Design a protein around this ligand. Structure first.
Ligand SMILES: CS(=O)(=O)N1CCc2c(c(-c3ccc(Cl)c(C#Cc4ccc5c(c4)CN[C@H](C(=O)N4CCCCC4)C5)c3)nn2CCCN2CCOCC2)C1
Length: 223
């Protein structure tokens, strides 16, 4: 059923790693990264979507606080409510709160709905990553080892299932045995392995990677 390893970069479904700088917008980058994959899947076009759009426009109605943090799930809801999100090129990232400047002329994607996965279920997360696409997740990124990660599979004994940082699961596999989740971060290419971190998989919901997963969908009609 499920492949032993998945890497959605292999299908050209993952945009370049972004750099959030001095702005707590990991939640926005995680959300656009998940939708970028669906847009390529459904239309063949890979285009970076506007995290700034979310920072500026998905605000108090969505419990989001711009550069002070927010949630992928309600980011998706904003995109649904708004009937669109702009391309990154048309609405570029400035790493600060701005007035909402959404322009339907430059809408690059929509969202029909989003699905939240059950808490801590790494088997269900694996199936979604394999069968649906990259999944937005929160992790516990509070511990210094996360900041210093360079290579290998990340395991932090002090990690908890309480999450405060948004990332994108773009695959999974095993490094010489050691099972991992392939995680796209938004701290630029100088973080980890060219912007990516392999996070311990199947170790009791390590760092909360499976605590609050979600993914959006762009539906093609229905029956
Ligand atoms: C405690 S819990 O784990 O139990 N859990 C509690 C329940 C929960 C959590 C997450 C979740 C899932 C995924 C992510 Cl990614 C995040 C997050 C986050 C986040 C992202 C960024 C920042 C902060 C937090 C905190 N501030 C940071 C900041 O300001 N910075 C400025 C200085 C430099 C950068 C940092 C930025 C949170 N979903 N749900 C379920 C839906 C919760 N409903 C969502 C709609 O509304 C009402 C609440 C957290």
């Amino acid at each position: 059923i499920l492949p032993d390893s998945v890497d959605w970069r292999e299908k050209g479904c993952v945009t370049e790693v972004k750099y959030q700088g001095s702005c707590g917008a990991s939640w926005a980058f995680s959300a656009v990264g998940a939708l970028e994959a669906q847009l390529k899947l459904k239309t063949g076009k890979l285009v970076s979507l506007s995290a700034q759009n979310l920072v500026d426009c998905s605000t108090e109605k969505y419990g989001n606080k711009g550069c002070n943090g927010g949630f992928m799930t309600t980011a998706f809801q904003y995109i649904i409510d708004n009937k669109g999100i702009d391309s990154d090129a048309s609405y570029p990232y400035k790493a600060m709160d701005q007035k909402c400047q959404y322009d339907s002329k430059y809408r690059a994607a929509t969202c029909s709905k989003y699905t939240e996965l059950p808490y801590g279920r790494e088997d269900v997360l694996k199936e979604a990553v394999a069968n649906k696409g990259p999944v937005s997740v929160g992790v516990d990124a509070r511990h210094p080892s996360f900041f210093l990660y360079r290579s290998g599979v990340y395991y932090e004994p002090s990690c908890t299932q309480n999450v405060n940082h948004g990332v994108l699961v773009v695959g999974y596999g095993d490094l010489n045995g050691k099972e991992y989740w392939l995680v796209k971060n938004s701290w630029g290419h100088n973080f980890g392995e060219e912007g990516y971190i392999r996070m311990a998989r199947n170790k009791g919901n390590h760092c909360g990677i499976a605590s609050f997963p979600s993914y959006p969908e762009i539906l093609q009609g229905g029956g």
